[model samples]
Target: GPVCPFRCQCHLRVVQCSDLGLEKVPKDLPPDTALLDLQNNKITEIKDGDFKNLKNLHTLILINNKISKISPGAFAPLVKLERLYLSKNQLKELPEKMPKTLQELRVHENEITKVRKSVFNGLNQMIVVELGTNPLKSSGIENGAFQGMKKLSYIRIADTNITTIPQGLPPSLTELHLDGNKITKVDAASLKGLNNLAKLGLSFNSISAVDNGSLANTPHLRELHLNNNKLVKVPGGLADHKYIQVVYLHNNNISAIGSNDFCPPGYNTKKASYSGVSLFSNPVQYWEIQPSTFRCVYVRAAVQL
Candidate 1:
């Protein structure tokens, strides 16, 4: 019996309460809310302590709304929240804050294209952030973007207008998605300490060439998605990480590749867990990679063993 003191649809079995034309998060509800499906509503605000009593809420779906504003501490009380879906809203900026334990977030298809420093503060454990289909053109990425978030593994910034990768990225960032955007540069320094990085998506952009320093520091990288760029060569790093398995390059302007560009490396359990390199969909001319020509990436490796 997932009751809403006011009028709302409650599915007791799944503990879902949704489709209520609510412009505000219900103040009173069942003691425990496993899943709150408040999607397809007109919610415009999320105040603090909205769920001070519901300690069991794991999922909160608030998609397809008019959420153009949120008060500070709006999500502070939702400590147990695991997944929050806020897509299809008219958000112009990152919400003031997020529930600390949040795992996944979907803010794609909105007008938000930039985030102030610490906008995602205290959420170092987030697994994914879907920021696609928006007007954002920049991501002020610094080492602090992933600060305190040692568990953050993936960040998706696709279908936007980004031209370059941010600097001082976290060393723990394992994956990134940058498709259908306007990126043109690939700096080896951008991935300097990202020793855990494995997969990167750079398709349907204006990328043409990877500078000499590109892929020099990523020793364990494996997969790369380059299906619609303008490349002129395939570096040995593409074929050197020793663990790359999939390369999606079916729709690019590549013209040639060097011998043994697909050769496999030694199979060791310690080879970065999330590694991959993709050079498909680009124009290639030669493989100008010299393994001993680059500096080693200085990364911190601590497993809490």
Candidate 2:
């Protein structure tokens, strides 16, 4: 094992040098060190050749730094890098290139305003990417930003300025969390070709309506979260799908749920059974006492909200 840097701890080839106020990356790192924890430091810029010799580095954590810029080729030598955390920094743009071996890349809470297609040119093995709390709406995302990322599964663009469902998402996407944005409507073309999407979260937005063809293409969608919105009616397209299990409609202006909304007869009665469908804390309620007296006639359905 190489000599440990001053005030740093080395255990099993892992270096923990967090909150050290270091002005620069320490030199003479052990060649075998896999995870380097340099979070909460004063590193402002990542110049070229910073990680030039760390070919075997696996995970690099650089959160809570003042990093505003990272020169190109800074991470080209980390051939085996898997996880890279650069959250809570001042990065104005995502690194143009990354190690192809990266699987999980978290760049949350940054100042990134644009995402180009070249930034993800060789990221085929990526699985999870978290880009939450960035101004993605004002950002310019190239048409094919996520074009060839077949293995990518989960993505979080929550708490940002994205106004519409992004284009060019691979079909393998499973979970998409876009809470706390400025989205006002869910149209048909916005969510097209996402067959494998299971969990769709659009909570804490200004979504007022979802088109009848919004969820028409997502056959495998299981959980649909529409909490804390301005919706006055049940989204018009759930009854056409069979795979939905949990439908969250809490904390909205909705005063009713149509009998034909979830498990309509001659519609989705032969579909999958729902486990949890919450309509709590809304203006109106699902009543068993006066079922027929309500606005929409309640029929004997497979599941009860």
Candidate 3:
């Protein structure tokens, strides 16, 4: 192997020592470099003020490392950092006093099990956060989880051990991924006030039923992914909603629709188009449905189908 060396990130604004055999934080201090990528290293510990002098650090990448310990205040000085990628590390917990102006955080594929209150007190402008494949088996959070976020949108906890979704997602949340968990029940009011929500991923779990009122607040949902779960029925109110264009229910336990399910059976159109769910691979499966409860897939179905 060549005798290539890696550098530290204390003063460096942007360093790219990727795929090097570094054992600790490489020392390549750039006075005002902003983008640093130290991927695939063997870094273990990150002490307080690690990037202290690099006040202009805007985007930091420490992915695919063997990092285990992250001391408190490890990322406090990089106040200008907007995006931080710490994925594929060995973090069991998050560093204390997270970056204040941070917008995106990707810390998935780790061992994080719990997130306490005030975990995101500093990030008032965060945009997206990925915490999937962690050990978050249980969650009971206050509305403060998204206290000061301005454009914070995506929250990925999929493939984790979460059993249920906590209330109080940010108002600007457009996408939420919570699949591959043990969540069996969905509180109808969990998304009681997300008007800007566009996509919600809830697959590969134990959700046997979905209530129509659960989606009464999500008026802007365009695409819904509910595949590979245990839902026997579909959202019965999609027939009379505002705008739900795409729906995916493949590999679920869904059976038949009566006309009352997605739309009321009391509709005018004899058979609705993509108006009703294109249900496939369900238990009580049906190619086209007349949902047992309501026949109103459209206002026409109310008079005809």
Candidate 4:
């Protein structure tokens, strides 16, 4: 016999107790409860074994709570958990024990600071992670913090204080957002193994230049955003990215665009194609004249903007 709480809603596998003025986890949740919605509650901490009875739990939503601490092994029984949302909480660090089966982990907009290497261990199936808008420091992230996340494709670490690209990013990543950081320069080693990376955002930073071979390996890159920076010269390394279609260099301090700025290394007698390139809001006054034998390769008629 399972006793449902007084004011909460309990269906077959879901227990929705959101915004119920709860000060702590309800004690009488059904043992087979699979999805628990505890968002918008006043819960401050997760006591040990509080969820031990709900072994079948799969999804837990604890957003907008006052949670600042979670006892060790608080979620140890959730072996089948797939999604967890801890956004808008007072958590300064990730909980000690998270489920290994999780595919989506959304902890954005929290007070998280340090990112220890073991925080995401065994999360091989994780695909999307949101750690943006936290106070994570440049030196707080471990060297291999994201090494084992093979399926991780989309990651948002924006608004953190990171100074350089963290090492050991999984090779399968497709999109990476690091905007609103303090990164100042980029070198080839900063993005070495991100061969499958398609979109990279470095907007709203202090970046001034990138090494010539910085993007030599990102062949599949499609979109590159470097706007709102302190750049004085267009990165020459972009010529190495043959498939890049969209380049956003607006709002920088660039003063000129070399004729071969976007051309391949040498011997561009045939021309090439580019989709969109924005140099707006810059003081660019000079468009260097091209060599005697040069024409827009496959550049669209309207790509000059």
How accurate locally is residue 65 in candidate 3, as Cα lDDT from 0 to 100?
Answer: 90
Estimated TM-score per prediction? 0.79, 0.91, 0.84, 0.90
lDDT: worst 10-residue window of model 1: 296-305
Candidates' C-alpha lDDT: 0.67, 0.81, 0.71, 0.80
Pick out the ten consecutive residues of candidate 4 with the lowest summed lDDT.
286-295
lDDT of 3 by residue, 1-305 (tens): 11124343333335777777677654436657678777888888787746767687888888999888988778888878898899999888766777788889899898886665476875778889888878767653344466456587888888887777767777788987888888887677778778888888887888877766776678788777777888777765676655665567777766665544464335545333443344567665343544444333343322212
Query: Could you give the C-alpha RMSD of every candidate to the true structure, in order shown?
Result: 7.8, 3.2, 5.2, 2.7
User: What is candidate 1's CA lDDT for residue 23?
Assistant: 74
* Leading candidate by TM-score: 2
Clashing pairs in 4: 271-297, 272-297, 272-298
- Considering summed lDDT, which 10 consecutive residues are worst modelled in model 2? 288-297
1-305, model 2: which lDDT tens digit per residue? 45688999988889999989997877678888899999999999898868856777999999999999998768868899999999999987889678888899899999888887787877988899999888677346667587667788998888988877777777889988888888888877757889999999999988888888888778899999998888898898666677887788888888766666665556334576666666777887567324422212233342344
Better of 2 and 3 by lDDT: 2
